[PDB]
Amino acid sequence: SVTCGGKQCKPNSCCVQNSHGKGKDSPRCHPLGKLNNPCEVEPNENGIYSQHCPCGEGLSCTKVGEPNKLRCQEES
């Protein structure tokens, strides 16, 4: 069970910070990253992402560019 912003969210959705510096960390529920899309290995020290979500639909963060342009790629 996922829990973001002091509220439980649906599965296949990571936590993302969407605060503009208001002082109240209020993340939002975003869908898991897809193929040929931008993804990150792991979240911050708190466990939250920026905008996109990590691979969770049968993908795997693989380096395709530089410096560290990690993208989602269906694992073999």
Side-chain angles (χ1 to χ4, degrees), residues 7-48:
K7 277 205 199 171
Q8 271 150 37
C9 282
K10 269 189 274 80
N12 312 282
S13 291
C14 75
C15 312
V16 286
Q17 213 90 94
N18 308 93
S19 273
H20 73 154
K22 59 212 292 291
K24 279 171 284 277
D25 50 274
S26 306
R28 210 64 169 162
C29 314
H30 241 46
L32 278 170
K34 74 177 80 163
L35 182 67
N36 312 135
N37 256 255
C39 71
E40 184 148 17
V41 183
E42 285 196 10
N44 326 321
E45 72 184 330
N46 286 289
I48 309 176

Side-chain angles (χ1 to χ4, degrees), residues 60-76:
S60 216
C61 264
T62 189
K63 195 188 140 211
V64 300
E66 33 166 13
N68 320 77
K69 191 167 198 68
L70 251 57
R71 310 287 116 159
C72 260
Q73 193 47 224
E74 284 272 358
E75 208 275 326
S76 291

